[PDB]
């Protein structure tokens, strides 16, 4: 609209309270929304819930007990590939929904940004607050959701899950609702996340955050990694944990795991590397021919190699920070 106002200011009725839980409880009240928007909210929750329920039924039919599948990891680390390959029961369920039904604060963003008009008119940042609020209501309706056997529904949470309080809250959720926690934790070097974000196209729906989001996400996910692992070392009945890291050639390998209380380190060298953020400054590093060639030198897959250099070439001569910033502002 007139400027980059958020959709919660635009479609919210009356003044916007400054601080959730004051803004939160205001957002949680349908009367605080224009009827068209409130109707949009209902339609998207119904689509999402229908997808999740489909996942839950597939998972239960494949003999999976009530489970919170958690996909931890920074932005664009390769979480979809890992899920598809390393959690085959989930891969079979996700195929029936084309990847829909997961709990993710970005799940509603495209729909909200297009507002049923047929084209994206709001920026990701304009719709973020609104879609966060929808995701929380979505998740709230799922926590005691049941399948047709009366069993609690399995659910899938693919957030960064970088912070302790996030981790603690999902564990508590699982404990209270009788769910196992299947957690896959996926790491890539920061530059892989940056390259990953620049390869994401605006017409594509995957989010395109600016540099500080990706960098701060990286620091937090790395610094809080071993706390997550401790929760599983300490309580084998919580579920299972697996850490996958990125080798030099870009392939994911398992690094550490807690499976049935059994703790092992499949790759001690990577385990040491990917539990700390290695602060040794990337934001100002310029994308030039050398950077591009260097990154290409460790990519053997042709399609990926091509997409990678194509994305980087568009911002040649720009710093990482400037490239992601520019790529982020695209609608």
């Amino acid at each position: 609209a007139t400027q980059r106002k958020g959709t919660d200011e635009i479609y919210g009725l009356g003044s916007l309270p400054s601080a959730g839980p004051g803004r939160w409880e205001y957002l949680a009240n349908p009367g605080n929304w224009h009827p068209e928007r409130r109707k949009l909210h209902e339609k998207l929750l119904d689509q999402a819930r229908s997808s999740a329920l489909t996942l839950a039924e597939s998972l239960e039919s494949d003999g999976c007990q009530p489970t919170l599948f958690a996909l931890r990891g920074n932005t664009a680390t390769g979480k979809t590939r890992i899920a598809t390959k390393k959690i085959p029961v989930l891969a079979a369920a996700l195929k029936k929904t084309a990847g829909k039904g997961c709990v993710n604060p970005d799940v509603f963003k495209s729909s909200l940004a297009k507002s049923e008009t047929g084209a994206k008119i709001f920026s990701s940042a304009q719709v973020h607050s609104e879609s966060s609020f929808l995701a929380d209501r979505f998740e709230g309706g799922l926590r005691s959701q049941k399948t047709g056997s009366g069993a609690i529904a399995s659910i899938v949470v693919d957030k960064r899950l970088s912070r302790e309080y996030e981790i603690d809250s999902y564990i508590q959720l699982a404990k209270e609702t009788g769910r196992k926690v299947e957690l896959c934790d996926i790491d890539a070097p920061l530059e892989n996340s940056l390259v990953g974000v620049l390869q994401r196209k605006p017409e594509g729906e995957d989010p395109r955050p600016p540099y500080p989001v990706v960098s701060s996400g990286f620091v937090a996910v790395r610094s809080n990694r071993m706390y997550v692992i401790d929760r599983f070392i300490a309580d084998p009945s919580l579920g299972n944990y697996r850490l996958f890291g990125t080798a030099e050639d870009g392939e994911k390998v398992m690094v550490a795991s807690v499976i049935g209380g059994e703790f092992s380190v499949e790759n001690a060298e990577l385990y040491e590397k990917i539990t700390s953020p290695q602060l040794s400054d990337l934001a100002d590093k310029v994308i030039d021919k050398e950077l591009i060639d260097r990154l290409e030198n460790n990519i053997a897959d042709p399609e990926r190699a091509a997409k990678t250099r194509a994305a980087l070439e568009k911002y040649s001569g720009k710093s990482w920070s400037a490239a992601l910033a520019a790529h982020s502002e695209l609608i």
Binding site: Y165, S216, V219, S223, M226, F263, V265
Partner: protein, 98 residues
Amino acid sequence: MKTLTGADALEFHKKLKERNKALHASDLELALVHADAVGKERFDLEELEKICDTSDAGRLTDAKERNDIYERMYYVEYPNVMTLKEFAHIVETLFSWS
């Protein structure tokens, strides 16, 4: 390489934790000395909270957590930011994304 199992895995895990905790502590310690030297504005959560939101829409409650997260981010991740005012732009950016 060879998988570490049983007691070796546990011991590698314990020793790595100590290593990362000293690194964790040391990163902030070193950033604070450098911040004093350049005259970077002292971190003040209350003042920051007056210019942006540090609750995750209430998801983040424990004030000892909100301080730890943001003070450490202010000094360790953004050492060239000199004002709480500038750091607010950053925090707002982080809150606008997943």
